[PDB]
């Protein structure tokens, strides 16, 4: 009964930036890990960055640490993936995806998920 509420992707130019949002509800505790995962066609989903919301702990894939930055909204069940330098290789489907503890987070296997935010990346 999680709910998550993604929004923020579309079709943007290489360098260009974009903003995701996800929000929670449904859940029953008050701090747990929430952030994205992407999926390229026919390949397997790979983390991209987390925070435990209501407080401060970030993780980033280093494929995407020096241009994207996580942020949270604890009163709003809120996370947000500032997406910079666009390159190419970004393009995919990013999922926001929770889990209580961070550390089973970032094995997706008893994640929440949403449904997922085309994000394109055009030359």
């Known amino acids: 009964q999680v709910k998550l509420e993604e929004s923020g992707g579309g079709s943007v130019q290489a360098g260009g930036s974009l903003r995701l949002s996800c929000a929670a509800s449904?859940?029953?505790?008050?701090?747990?890990?929430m952030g994205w995962f992407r999926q390229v066609p026919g390949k397997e989903r790979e983390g991209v960055a987390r925070?435990?919301?209501?407080?401060?702990?970030?993780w980033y894939a280093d494929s995407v640490r020096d241009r994207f930055t996580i942020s949270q909204d604890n009163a709003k069940n809120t996370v947000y993936l500032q997406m910079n330098s666009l390159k190419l290789e970004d393009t995919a489907i990013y999922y926001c995806t929770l889990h209580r503890f961070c550390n089973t987070w970032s094995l997706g296997t008893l994640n929440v998920w949403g449904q997922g935010t085309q994000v394109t990346v055009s030359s």
């Open positions: 449904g859940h029953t505790y008050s701090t747990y890990c």
């Open positions: 925070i435990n919301v209501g407080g401060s702990s970030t």
